[PDB]
């Protein structure tokens, strides 16, 4: 996260770290949506142009973390994966449309003060909260600047949703309604963005109607990090929510 701050303990208890087994590397963020299911970006798991295609045995999911590096005895849980599910229409060639995947844990994770699922939006959440100028929150252990730049602890930044035409005009890539964009406009003081290794983490919003946190987006893509006139693009979770429910119904 660029221009963020240290997250407080327990502030994002659905945050998940995706960690490569061999060689050991921080890969991406993810989010806990139930005791057995984790949501992330498809490109964290599958990216043919770089010969990326992880199997379930290649990765760990680390839940409950704050420190990027210390094994957090007493708090963190490391879970193995039973199965990965990539959206079948994930479009890595053109624009990362449908950049979404689900991971099923081999065993359910015990909730705690540090481990707790985020809500998925319903129809009326999406209607009420996805409006230009409203801010959501992005968290992760990604790099602190476009590229060692690694943070000591989980970072957080709050970013406003941007108008659809401004998102479209900011890039020559064909963007779709399965994504939205967020970030500050140039010359307006505050800035900030997700960056490398924050992909797959959640863009969350707190409802003023019921005070729950809902995951509206997944960190998907951008042109570098925190560039003037560019925005971060996020997978629109509600638009893909039928697929999420279909996978969990069929496999949970």
């Amino acid at each position: 996260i660029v221009e963020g701050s240290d997250a407080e303990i327990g502030m994002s208890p659905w945050q998940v770290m995706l960690f490569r087994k061999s060689p050991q590397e921080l890969l991406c963020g993810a989010s806990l949506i139930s005791d057995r299911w984790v949501l992330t970006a498809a490109h964290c798991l599958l990216y043919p142009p770089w010969d990326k295609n992880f199997t379930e045995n290649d990765l760990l999911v680390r839940i409950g973390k704050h420190s990027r590096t210390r094994y957090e005895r007493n708090i963190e849980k490391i879970s193995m994966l039973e199965k990965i599910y990539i959206h079948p229409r994930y479009n890595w060639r053109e624009n990362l449309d449908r950049d979404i995947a689900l991971m099923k844990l081999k065993k359910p994770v015990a909730f705690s003060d540090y481990i707790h699922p985020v809500c998925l939006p319903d129809r009326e959440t999406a209607a009420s909260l996805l409006q230009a100028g409203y801010k959501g929150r992005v968290t992760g252990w990604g790099n602190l600047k476009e590229t060692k730049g690694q943070p000591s602890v989980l970072q957080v930044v709050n970013l406003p949703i941007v108008e659809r035409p401004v998102c479209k005009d900011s890039t020559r890539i064909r963007i779709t309604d399965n994504m939205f964009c967020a970030g500050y406009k140039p010359d307006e003081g505050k800035r900030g963005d997700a960056c490398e290794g924050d992909s797959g983490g959640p863009f969350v919003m707190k409802s003023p109607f019921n005070n729950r946190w809902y995951q509206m987006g997944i960190v998907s893509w951008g042109e570098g990090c925190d560039r003037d006139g560019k925005y971060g693009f996020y997978t629109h979770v509600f638009r893909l929510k039928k697929w999420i429910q279909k996978v969990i119904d069929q496999f949970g």
């Binding site: 960690f19 490569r20 050991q24 590397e25 921080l26 890969l27 991406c28 970006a41 490109h43 964290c44 990216y47 142009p49 770089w50 990326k52 760990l60 590096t69 210390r70 094994y71 490391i78 879970s79 193995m80 060639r93 053109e94 624009n95 990362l96 950049d99 252990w141 990604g142 790099n143 476009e146 590229t147 060692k148 690694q150 890539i173 960056c195 490398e196 290794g197 924050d198 992909s199 960190v219 998907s220 893509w221 951008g222 042109e223 570098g224 990090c225």
Partner: peptide, 24 residues
């Protein structure tokens, strides 16, 4: 379960999300 002693300053993997091939 996974033995945590198997783990600390691991690198962050280059992320295609911020360097997608569709821009090159």
């Amino acid at each position: 379960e996974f033995d945590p002693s198997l783990l600390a300053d691991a690198p962050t993997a280059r992320d295609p999300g911020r360097n997608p091939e569709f821009l090159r």
